[model samples]
Target: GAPATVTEQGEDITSKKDRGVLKIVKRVGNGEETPMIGDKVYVHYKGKLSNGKKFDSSHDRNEPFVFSLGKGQVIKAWDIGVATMKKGEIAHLLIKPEYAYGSAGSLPKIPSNATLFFEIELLDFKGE
Candidate 1:
């Protein structure tokens, strides 16, 4: 059998614009989670493809991810998304392709122009 597909009318402009924006559904943190270029952060998060395929996670590994935000250590999406979050906050980040890997996808997983989804939990910061 051939692959099946379904198509529907696109949403209105307003909805589409809103979807492109990263909307914070709630403020669950007490302090700003903003990190300097070299400030390392401890985070627990899960990432999925646009089709809902699980790709990465700190929680499932029984460890947390520690990275220096804005230090060119990760994809552009993460470099920007982590900055908007606050400590102890859990966020659902909807990232577009332009802010991510762009035309070139990661080998064997991410596809070109793919939208990324992340559920991130900011645990704490360490800069020493």
Candidate 2:
């Protein structure tokens, strides 16, 4: 299904100014383990351009990627999408250019003004 048009219900996650949607794919564990800003998170993900071309996959490396939540260490879409996820939950993020790579893009793999799609699985996280 295409992402919902727009909603500011603030239920599951905050909608990014109609630029993207964080759709839950699967849920596991206690469901109370959502991360907060400054928390460190471990995740597995597969990212693709809107054309469906695969750009990166941490799962292919057989390891989870770690980063501090709410830091600029990763893209904006990630910080937003991941913060709403509970441990062991899988989410699909449809990101607009503004939230993903923006107008200049990430180059080589991503193009200028490109939108992105990502399948992300939250493995674990440590809250501050």
Candidate 3:
């Protein structure tokens, strides 16, 4: 994958180029704690397809999503990506098909083998 490019569209709207499998746009947390296996994490995320179509958004619901790490509770890409994050970090995860919904895909929302994009913010975590 190539380096990410920030292109200005207009009126403060900007689109960013894909930066490989995962990209961390900002790290607001100074804590050294990282999510590990069995750790419970709370986060806010926006999920979309490469076509810029949104599929899900925790921010829209004004709530943080919680899940345990490495327990097969969610997508594989999420486990890998969230493991790299610390509390209060905002990151962009550019997931390849294999790391995302894969060939099966989530019906009615995500198509087969679609490249997924996510903006995730780690709110808190309970380490095991």
Instruction: Give the root-mean-square deviation of each candidate in angstroms.
Output: 6.8, 3.7, 6.9
* Per-model TM against the reference: 0.76, 0.81, 0.79
What would the per-residue lDDT of candidate 3 be over residues 1-128, giving only the tens digit for each residue? Answer: 11132112111111232332656555566588889989989999888886676568997787789999999998877887788787888877667777778789888888898887777899888976
Q: For this target, which candidate reaches the highest lDDT against the unseen true structure?
A: 2
What does the lDDT come to for candidate 2?
A: 0.73
RMSD of 1: 6.8
Clashes of each: 1, 0, 0
Output the better candidate (1/3) by TM-score: 3
Candidate 2 has a TM-score of 0.81
**Candidates, ranked, lDDT:** 2, 3, 1
lDDT of 2 by residue, 3-107 (tens): 332122222344645635445555554567688889999999887775766568997788899999988898887888888787888777777787778889777
- Whole-structure CA lDDT of model 3: 0.72
lDDT of 3 at 29: 67
Off-target runs (Cα >4 Å) in candidate 1 are: 1-21, 25-27
Can you tell me which runs of candidate 2 are displaced by over 4 Å? 1-16
Q: For residues 21-100, could you state the per-residue lDDT of candidate 1 as single tens digits?
A: 25342348766446556778889987777576547788778999888877887776676666666788876666667767
